[PDB]
Write a protein that binds this ligand. Sequence first.
Ligand code: 239
Length: 245
Amino acid sequence: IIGGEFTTIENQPWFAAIYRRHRGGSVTYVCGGSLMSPCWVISATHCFIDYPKKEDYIVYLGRSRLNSNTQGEMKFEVENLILHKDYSADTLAHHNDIALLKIRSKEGRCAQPSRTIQTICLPSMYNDPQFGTSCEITGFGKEQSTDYLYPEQLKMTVVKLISHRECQQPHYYGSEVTTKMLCAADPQWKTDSCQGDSGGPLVCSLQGRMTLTGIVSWGRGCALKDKPGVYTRVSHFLPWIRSHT
Ligand SMILES: N=C(N)c1ccc2cc(C(=O)Nc3ccc(CN)cc3)ccc2c1
């Protein structure tokens, strides 16, 4: 997250930290995700497609720092990695960028809700918030595009949603951005998600209810003028999410 503020997991308790174990034992951070029911975390297929072996991943719920074992966290392995069957990647745009991770502890259990581990609600069919709405994103991604290290403490920021007709303007993304995708950004281009934030949540408060409106997917640079962050529009995928869970 470029700009924004430092935060801890009690303020974003549906956030999942997803890591991959390499041959030889080291473990590195991969992408974010969101808890939608005790056994199911949803994220982006691009974080996994080049390493599609479910045994390789470690998922933490309740975790606030990249290298510290936060009180109350829970650690899980992946029982089923489900990637969308018509996923694909153009130069900038990524399509059907959505994945499900069914999680289980070493004892065979799903997550146990607590003050620092909670689910986030799914949207309804045909009802996403109007353009101009403020929504929050969260992750452990880069604080500047020239960094190579990620921040030790979790960050968040707030951005505004952008219409399909503005996002398809020539100096923004043209016809590369589609109606299955949602754009959001700072009007002053100073804060955004960035590499390392992919898969993480775009949460919007809609008619009273905090709602998983989007999944971090792609963008040209980070916090670059006229180049929004682009997010998978979760309401379109409700028939795929219900049939695969
Ligand atoms: N401008 C943003 N909000 C934004 C949002 C998401 C972003 C994602 C990546 C990224 O590195 N993506 C990626 C895509 C596919 C693969 C698989 N080769 C690996 C990483 C990099 C920069 C990104 C920037």
